[PDB]
């Protein structure tokens, strides 16, 4: 029997995704992709859903209010993934709902990190990140880091 039903970051995003995708459990994004790779419907849906959206859904935060949180935050984007973050304008935290969302925002980014990697793994590139350039502020900063990368 497997124990330790507690994980923060990384495998936590996997655990939330595997739960959401109704797939097998996964210890790494690499193994996660492989399971999804077996689940054709999930695989295709991961590209059909946007990383931001797919990840946000996994937590169950209200789209608008969740977006409201990240627009007022900033993020350390390491390798196209939010590795760290902090709130820039605590205006959104006026709502205890968003407080709840914020205090557990890392969960989202954990899941986001996963879908951000998985969507790259399954698809060499896809229009399923969030919106043009980026979802909402968060991915814009990511795209911003990518803009620094003059090809």
The number of angstroms, rounded, from the C-alpha of 3 to the middle of its chain's C-alpha atoms is 25
Structure tokens at 66: 């969740």
Q: How far apart are CA 77 and CA 144, in angstroms?
A: 9
> If you ran DSSP here, which 8-state letter would residue 23 be given?
-
CA distances from 126 to 72, 87, 105, 118, 132 (A): 27, 29, 24, 11, 12
The two tokens of residue 74 are: 């900033």
Question: Do residues 86 and 102 touch, judged by C-beta distance below 8 A?
Answer: no
Give Cα separations from 32 to 8, 27, 60, 100, 102 (angstroms). 16, 7, 21, 28, 26
Technique used? NMR
∠ at Cα 146 (140, 124), nearest 5°? 100
Instruction: Kindly state the tokens that stand for 100.
Output: 């709840």
The pair of structure tokens assigned to 120 is 């790259």
> What is the chain's length?
151
Helix (H) or strand (E) holding 55: helix 51-59
Strand positions, DSSP E, 50-116: 73-78, 81-87
Q: Are the CB atoms for 27 and 10 separated by under 8 Å? A: no
Under 8 Å between Cβ of 51 and 142: no
In degrees and rounded to multiples of 5, residue 61 shows phi and psi of -70, 140
Angular region, 62: left φ>0, alpha ψ -120 to 50, beta rest? beta
Q: Which helix (H) or strand (E) holds 145?
A: helix 138-147
């Amino acid at each position: 029997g497997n124990g330790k039903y507690f994980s923060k970051v990384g495998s936590a995003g996997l655990k939330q995704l595997t739960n959401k995708l109704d797939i097998n459990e996964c210890a790494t994004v690499d193994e996660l992709v492989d399971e999804i790779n077996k689940s054709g419907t999930v695989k295709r849906k991961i590209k059909n859903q946007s990383a931001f959206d797919l990840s946000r859904e996994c937590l169950g935060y209200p789209e608008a209010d969740f977006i409201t949180l990240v627009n007022n935050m900033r993020f350390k984007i390491e390798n196209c993934k939010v590795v760290n973050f902090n709130i820039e304008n605590t205006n959104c935290l006026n709502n205890p709902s968003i407080e709840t969302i914020y205090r557990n925002f890392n969960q989202f980014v954990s899941i986001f990190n996963v879908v951000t990697d998985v969507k790259k793994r399954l698809f060499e590139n896809a229009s399923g990140n969030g919106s043009g350039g980026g979802s909402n502020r968060l991915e814009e900063e990511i795209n911003n880091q990518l803009a620094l990368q003059k090809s």
